[PDB]
Design a protein around this ligand. Structure first.
Ligand SMILES: NC(=O)c1ccc[n+]([C@@H]2O[C@H](COP(=O)([O-])OP(=O)(O)OC[C@H]3O[C@@H](n4cnc5c(N)ncnc54)[C@H](O)[C@@H]3O)[C@@H](O)[C@H]2O)c1
Ligand SMILES: NC(=O)c1ccc[n+]([C@@H]2O[C@H](COP(=O)([O-])OP(=O)(O)OC[C@H]3O[C@@H](n4cnc5c(N)ncnc54)[C@H](O)[C@@H]3O)[C@@H](O)[C@H]2O)c1
Lengths: 356, 359
């Protein structure tokens, strides 16, 4: 790969390759931006096609977080750690003890947490070497509650009222998040239509909150007024968009849009898309509140705020006549840049999340 | 395939650093921090391709690990490679940015000058961090020390091949009269030695002929000159299949890096009875100086660790017989043994532990 060219393109800050032989650790800490403060991003551990793909993923996801964290109104930049390995096989104490040290070797530029293929017990070993790590002491139900709120503000644009009574919701997946979402939804007298590749998981959902069950590859064309992807990404492509009955999309899934283009057209069909990385923010917003020093109430109230973040993204989608994801991209950028100026005053006793 | 190369020689980190406003593209390679903070200079050169820049970084860092170890420093191996034309691409912003990234490593990496970086460069880096050495406005020389470093290294080499550590009456082929080579000659001449000097700057040669009553040879010829010691103080890979059979001296000892063009050239020189003072043990003087800058500079103690080079070569010479292996291999093992020996002897717990950073 031609790394530095990619870095100078989106003005990434650092890509930190870490290797301990005794453990066999091969980790890439990508840091895109630290303007708002320490880069927060999880440790992903997956088996990769090739080293080139691992580096690509790292950078992709970090540049991601920069925007999630910005829009969620956190004081944190964008980063993500990718370990190359089979989480089922290649993990050790040494592995996480080593990475921990490398993370303290960055002295607060990077803060990690769990992602795909890392337990808490993992972070707990990392915690032995450093405090630049979160999600160890009291995340799916919060993410889910995050959507519950996000859905309402989305409903209020395309529906006129933030009430969900009479609205039909197609809930794709009954995963850890989706399950907890449903509870909250149908207990406001909306109508739930559920689907999943684990059919027993579906049955729990139909039985508990009176949903209709549908085959995985039907959920799009179901007569429904809102769509909630909580299983798979790139679920909003040329094949599913014309199948779609709903006038509102809002779910937990990442990369809901298969290409940038699909957002642009959905806008012009009158369909109101709550952008992925604004909604699922709930989970991050929680581990983020862990660092300031956890408070259950205040934590949830910044999660509750997702409503208003969507509402503002919705507003700008009209006020500028652009797809909701583009408004969201700009909401973040505007924040990052606005503070960059407003904070460029000197203090010798400066304050950040690390000064807890 | 980076990670494979890293896991091969158990490198620790490769830190890619980029600030767009300055255009900085820097690779801080860190091979080992066993003995403590990795010390290594910032090189700034124009590179064929990004692949070659990463390769260089790793090469040079893995280098320092061993130089620092053998020189008896409490420092690991690192090197920073900026991709750029030092003549064109430099800015305050560039070095202000890199400085921050270096403080972003909080004492794992300590930088200094190398090819394509001024002190004024380090002075801008110093604005952002103290993990940096060779600051002249504040302080080394540092060429004459490197040179004195060789003077001592050459003596122990002479005593092995030639029988006495005196250089009186010995003829010395000094390839290059650079800033180091000159000051080496200064010591040599004033110990009753005889110099055969060569250089692409013919005025630099004239200074040497005039000041040390020295002989001169055309650049191409310095190898086959009838002389007792060969001292490469200009270019590396000067000990290749071309020059080794041309070589009349029984001792090689100079300031130049990568004196051996390939590993094998060391192996054969051993069996010809030529006594090679290995590059990274002899020229250590310069590092050993900026290294003493951090503990807090002390002219006497600084030089006395440089003086020690005599004994480091002598030990490398000893092991070259006691195990029957080329002097560079003995040097590689001298370092390894030290790194590993201390790794054990220091694995006792202290909460109030002491390192060069706790000066
Ligand atoms: N957990 C969080 O905080 C969070 C935040 C960001 C990411 N996400 C996103 O949300 C999901 C993770 O939530 P989770 O951990 O609760 O879910 P999960 O991984 O526990 O469950 C996902 C469900 O998707 C179903 N599924 C897979 N393919 C399907 C298909 N083609 N059609 C229908 N169902 C299918 C599976 O059967 C499974 O039950 C992912 O899409 C992820 O990208 C969640
Ligand atoms: N200065 C130090 O502390 C130090 C320590 C480590 C590295 N070195 C080594 O020393 C070498 C130079 O030391 P310096 O910085 O004192 O020198 P310098 O750069 O000040 O001078 C180099 C000299 O080499 C001569 N030269 C170049 N190519 C030549 C050739 N083909 N034939 C003959 N002469 C030639 C030039 O005319 C010039 O006078 C470097 O190549 C490096 O390997 C020096």
């Amino acid at each position: 790969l031609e790394i530095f060219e990619y870095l100078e393109k989106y003005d990434y800050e650092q890509v930190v390759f870490c290797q301990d032989k005794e453990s066999g650790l091969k980790a890439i800490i990508a840091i895109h931006d630290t303007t708002l403060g320490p880069a927060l991003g999880g440790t992903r551990m997956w088996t990769y096609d090739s080293e080139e793909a691992a580096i690509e993923d790292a950078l992709r996801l970090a540049k991601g977080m920069t925007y999630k964290n910005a829009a969620a109104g956190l004081n944190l930049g964008g980063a993500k750690t990718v370990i190359i390995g089979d989480p089922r096989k290649d993990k050790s104490e040494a592995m996480f003890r080593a990475l921990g040290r490398y993370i303290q070797g960055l002295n607060g530029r990077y803060i990690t947490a769990e992602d795909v293929g890392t337990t808490v017990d993992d972070m707990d070993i990392i915690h032995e070497e450093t405090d630049f790590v979160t999600g160890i002491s009291p995340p799916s139900p919060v993410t889910a509650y995050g959507v519950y709120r996000g859905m309402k503000a989305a409903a209020k644009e395309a529906v006129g009222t933030d009430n969900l009574e009479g609205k039909v919701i197609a809930v794709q997946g009954v995963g850890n998040v989706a399950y907890h979402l449903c509870k909250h939804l149908h207990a406001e007298g909306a109508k739930l239509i559920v689907t999943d590749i684990n059919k027993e998981a579906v049955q729990r959902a139909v039985e508990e909150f009176g949903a209709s069950a549908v085959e995985p590859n039907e959920i799009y064309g179901v007569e429904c007024d809102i769509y909630a992807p909580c299983a798979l990404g790139a679920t909003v492509n040329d094949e599913t968009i014309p199948q779609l009955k709903a006038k509102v999309i809002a779910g937990s899934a990442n990369n809901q849009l298969k290409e940038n283009r699909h957002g642009d057209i959905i806008h012009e069909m009158g369909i109101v898309y709550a952008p992925d990385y604004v909604i699922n923010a709930g989970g991050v917003i929680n581990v983020a509140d862990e660092l300031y020093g956890y408070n259950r109430e205040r934590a949830l109230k910044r999660v509750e705020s997702i409503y208003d973040t969507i509402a503002k993204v919705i507003e700008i989608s009209k006020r500028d006549g652009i797809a909701t994801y583009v408004a969201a991209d700009r909401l973040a950028e505007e924040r990052i840049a606005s503070l960059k100026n407003s904070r460029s005053t000197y203090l010798r006793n400066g304050h950040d999340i690390i000064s807890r």
